[PDB]
Write a protein that binds this ligand. Structure first.
Ligand code: 9VG
Length: 481
């Protein structure tokens, strides 16, 4: 493995020009700048691309202690600049007082040299796509790969987590900082592990929240999901079953689940299903629910949605705005393309299609909610380029001074087992905070858990870390322990 420090250093001498972020409503309130990075760090004098940065300066200059870099997006496919705006609105005031918060879109999406390939709306849901039948899905996923191959072949070798880690080093140098702090979620926690593994002597304080397993790269991210999807759905069903009076879905978790399964039975046989006046298909009937289950505070929304698919017409106004937020528009395309490129650019997927059919059929039986969608054939199996570098070896020689891991005990897409594995791999420099009785993605600061907020703030502000892993309770749990 090679760091390519010479090429990184070559681009660290930049001094970006910051101005108000005036060209996008969600970013008003922030400054914006552009940076150049090489496409290929083995070819520093070759082709380059531009990254879009945003910043919110420390509100108390006399107390400023450094830069807090936000990992470039939570779930892979999402924009880091938009995450930074969200965080500026919800981080503790004292964190905002002492840190310049800097965020960025990683290479190939958003404000950072976006790549689009003509993907149709259905194609942008390739990750959670539920198959008609296996032969149809082979063709569906192969054709997704075909579009990216045709329109982006020349940059696909350079879509990797290690290159984003080098990009982070360029940002750090450009900001003029010897050390930076880091806050990351989901894919941002894999990037945080990689960047600290490669360059962690330059880390100050590091918080990773809702943790990618180090074992996942990258098909395990998919094949570990269905059991956690089933568990999260069942937890909601228990919550719904205690509320039959107000929801009308059933008085046992089995009955609520059968109500929902009846909606799946319908889309899985091209029988019409609508939520308000908006049609569901095999994928959306499951993905709308996955989207809700990313936070157990959405349980009421999900009751309204399932009720509206079974009987009703209208949804409650609140639910309509939240669903319109989340779906309403097509999934942002360049993020879909970058998500494909990274998942296949980091690591070579199996290419034998019989493996996927076997796995799809087994997972459809053991975990029906999302088994077939997660374990079956996916576009990286047909990818036109191999990885340019081996996967980073994460391990207890990680040079970061300290890493705090934050994890909701019942989170779905990044489960507690994944955080525990990351803790084992990173070794004694890391500590794990588990938040009990909480099925939520991105705990600090978004959930408002007093215990997590207090412990993370004490680390970021004062450098306090517990002596060993700790648990904190949820004082307002959606269901009993
Ligand atoms: C790569 O590191 C991670 O830990 C990533 C994840 C746990 C996920 O980001 C991933 C998702 C990919 C999507 O395409 C998602 C979503 C992702 N969430 C995480 C997941 C998962 C399981 C397979 C995957 C993946 C990642 O690309 C997602 O939650 C959605 C919710 C509601 C609307 C749409 C979606 C999506 O389309």
């Amino acid at each position: 493995p090679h760091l390519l420090t010479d090429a990184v250093r070559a681009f660290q001498a930049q001094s970006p020009v910051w101005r108000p972020a005036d060209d996008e409503e969600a970013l008003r309130g922030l400054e914006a700048a552009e940076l150049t990075v090489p496409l290929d760090y083995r070819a520093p004098a070759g082709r380059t691309l531009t990254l879009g940065l945003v910043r919110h300066r420390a509100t108390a200059p006399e107390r400023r202690r450094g830069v807090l870099l936000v990992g470039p997006g939570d779930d892979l496919g999402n924009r880091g600049t938009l995450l930074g705006a969200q965080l500026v609105g919800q981080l503790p005031k004292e964190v905002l007082a002492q840190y310049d918060v800097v965020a960025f879109d990683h290479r190939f999406m958003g404000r950072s040299s976006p790549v689009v390939c003509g993907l149709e709306p259905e194609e942008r849901f390739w990750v959670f796509h539920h198959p008609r039948d296996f032969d149809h899905e082979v063709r569906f996923q192969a054709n997704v790969a075909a579009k990216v191959a045709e329109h982006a072949l020349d940059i696909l070798p350079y879509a990797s987590s290690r290159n984003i880690a080098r990009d982070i080093e360029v940002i750090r140098g450009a900001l003029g900082e010897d050390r930076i702090s880091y806050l990351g979620y989901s894919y941002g926690t894999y990037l945080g592990a990689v960047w600290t593994q490669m360059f962690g002597e330059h880390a100050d304080r590091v918080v990773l929240d809702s943790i990618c397993s180090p074992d996942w790269v990258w098909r395990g991210l998919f094949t570990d999901f269905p059991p956690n999807g089933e568990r999260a759905l069942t937890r909601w069903a228990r919550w719904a079953a205690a509320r039959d009076a107000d929801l009308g879905l059933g008085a046992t978790d089995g009955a609520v689940r059968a109500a929902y399964d009846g909606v799946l039975a319908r889309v899985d046989t091209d029988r019409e299903v609508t939520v308000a006046g908006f049609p569901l298909d095999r994928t959306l009937a499951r993905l709308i629910v996955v989207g809700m289950l990313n936070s157990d505070r959405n349980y009421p929304f999900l009751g309204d949605i399932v009720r509206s698919a079974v009987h009703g017409g209208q949804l409650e106004p609140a639910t309509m705005g939240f669903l319109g937020q989340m779906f309403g528009q097509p999934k942002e395309e360049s993020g879909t393309v970058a998500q494909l490129a990274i998942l296949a650019g980091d690591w070579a997927w199996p290419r034998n299609v019989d493996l996927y059919e076997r796995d799809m059929e087994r997972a459809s039986r053991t975990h029906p909610f999302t088994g077939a969608a997660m374990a079956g054939i996916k576009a990286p199996a047909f990818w036109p380029v191999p990885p340019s570098e081996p996967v980073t070896r994460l391990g207890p020689d990680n040079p970061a001074d300290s890493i705090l891991l934050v994890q909701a005990a019942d989170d779905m897409s990044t489960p507690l087992a994944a955080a525990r594995r990351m803790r084992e791999v990173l070794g004694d420099t890391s500590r794990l905070l588990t938040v009990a009785d909480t099925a939520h993605h991105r705990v600090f600061p978004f959930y408002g858990n007093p215990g997590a907020d207090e412990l993370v703030t004490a680390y970021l502000v004062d450098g306090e870390l517990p002596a060993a892993d700790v648990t904190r309770p949820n004082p307002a749990p959606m269901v009993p322990t």
